[PDB]
Design a protein around this ligand. Structure first.
Ligand SMILES: OC[C@H]1O[C@H](O[C@H]2[C@H](O)[C@@H](O)[C@@H](O)O[C@@H]2CO)[C@H](O)[C@@H](O)[C@@H]1O
Length: 460
């Protein structure tokens, strides 16, 4: 249960959660309603799990691309801002938080990656990706390096993958086509090949994550990084005179970041929906409320018109918007999760040498476009729901290592949860092949396996 009479808020650890709590303490002062701001790890994954059982926070913050999956699962309340309030934010930020005709979150700020560069190490930052290897050789001779950014999250490597023509889902006739994915076309391959060549030539290292990259740039050890507005604050505290500018071009085309709109959603199980609306609309989405958060960690280009007029004067914000206008606003469709997981696997495997570029993106393509619900439906109705409780717990014990099933998970997870985890580890037809292989030599399920063999040909 969620505690009535107060507000719990989840926001990512890289945003200004202390400034957000200052706005919460003003809310407590004015109303008597305690606001608790928390930043748990993997919150975009933790929320769907806890919210699917009526738990979790009253308000969740994340970029808009996750919210369509949350809304489709019924985890959010439809927000209804009055006409007068909607006029206070830019029309396109409302578009980012609209799903199935319903507004499903409050838009807060627009984020786009930019190139951040140390002006003392590099007064003329490169215009092209192609010239960076030469810059790195010259900089390594001084004991520095040219560029370090997070290679563990595909968000940061996407601008280069999209540059020569890679894309997520085709936008066709007013809607996203979930079957037309562009992650293994010629442009996506060319971009990822360049990234792997940057690593193979020891200009970057496959192990670099967010913490390593940020520490490297803020200690003056690398000349450039790739990050968004939240990261400016820590560079201000460090002794690095930095600039924020346009991402380098690749093969003469601009880098195309996926643009995210930081948004706040209201848990459908929250008993404090009216309080949540009051806090977001009249304490956060004000010049005073946004200023408290922005001073902690820069939000980017805020959705609130009156306050963005002041922030648009900042050159770092003009750079953020210039990069954004070369990319696109992320889709919010529920398939975006499967897209991000698939691209993450491709970038990591290619960057490490596990798979060739062509192998990694081919797998990411088919995984992103796969008919996940179709196979889950077969796995559940024609597989798990046709075996008894004794055989179900036996199968879960066989799957323990593969699905990361603790002892408690093996006792409590039901067939729907196991079906979801299984198809995510064994994508598409492979999850039917894994159950057939697992239930092969169980004489009681010979009939079950018999149909799964036919229903996997029937679906094909
Ligand atoms: O890399 C996958 C990841 O990309 C985006 O996440 C961004 C987020 O929008 C930024 O605000 C910041 O926190 O960096 C994140 C990447 O680490 C998507 O929003 C997210 O759904 C996706 O998993």
């Amino acid at each position: 249960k969620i505690e009535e009479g107060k507000l719990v808020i989840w926001i990512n650890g890289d945003k200004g959660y202390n400034g957000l709590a200052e706005v919460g303490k003003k809310f407590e002062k004015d109303t008597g309603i305690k606001v608790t701001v928390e930043h748990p790890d993997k919150l975009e994954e933790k929320f769907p799990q806890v919210a699917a059982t009526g738990d979790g926070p009253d308000i969740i913050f994340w970029a808009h691309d996750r919210f369509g999956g949350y809304a489709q699962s019924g985890l959010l309340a439809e927000i209804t801002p009055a006409a007068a309030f909607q006029d206070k934010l830019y029309p396109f930020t409302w578009d980012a938080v609209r799903y199935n005709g319903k507004l499903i979150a409050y838009p807060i700020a627009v984020e786009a990656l930019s190139l951040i560069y140390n002006k003392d190490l590099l007064p003329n930052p490169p215009k092209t990706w192609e010239e960076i290897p030469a810059l790195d050789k010259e900089l390594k001779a001084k004991g520095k390096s040219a560029l370090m950014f997070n290679l563990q999250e595909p968000y940061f490597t996407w601008p280069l993958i999209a540059a020569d023509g890679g894309y997520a889902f085709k936008y066709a006739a007013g809607k996203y086509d979930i079957k037309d994915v562009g992650v293994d076309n010629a442009g996506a391959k060319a971009g990822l090949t360049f990234l792997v060549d940057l690593i193979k030539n020891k200009h970057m290292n496959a192990d670099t994550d967010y913490s390593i990259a940020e520490a490297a740039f803020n200690k003056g050890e690398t000349a450039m990084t790739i990050n968004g507005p939240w990261a400016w604050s820590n560079i201000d505290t460090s002794a690095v005179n930095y600039g924020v500018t346009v991402l380098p071009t690749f093969k003469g085309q601009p880098s195309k970041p996926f643009v995210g709109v930081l948004s706040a959603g209201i848990n459908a199980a929250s008993p404090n929906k009216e309080l949540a609306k009051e806090f977001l609309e009249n304490y956060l989405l004000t010049d005073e409320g946004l200023e408290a958060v922005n001073k902690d960690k820069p939000l980017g280009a805020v959705a609130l018109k009156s306050y963005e007029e002041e922030l648009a004067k900042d050159p770092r914000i003009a750079a953020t918007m210039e990069n954004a206008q070369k990319g696109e606003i992320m889709p919010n469709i529920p398939q975006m999760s499967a897209f991000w997981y698939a691209v993450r696997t491709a970038v990591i495997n290619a960057a490490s040498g596990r798979q060739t570029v062509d192998a990694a993106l081919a797998a990411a393509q088919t995984n992103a476009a796969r008919a996940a619900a179709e196979y889950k439906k077969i796995l559940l109705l024609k597989g798990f729901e046709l075996m008894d409780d004794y055989h179900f717990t036996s199968i879960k014990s066989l799957l323990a290592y593969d699905l990361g099933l603790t002892t408690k998970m093996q006792e409590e997870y039901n067939r729907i949860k196991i079906t979801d985890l299984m198809e995510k580890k064994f994508q598409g037809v492979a999850c039917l092949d894994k159950l057939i292989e697992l239930a092969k030599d169980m004489p009681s399920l010979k009939n079950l396996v018999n149909n799964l063999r036919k229903e996997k040909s029937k679906v094909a």
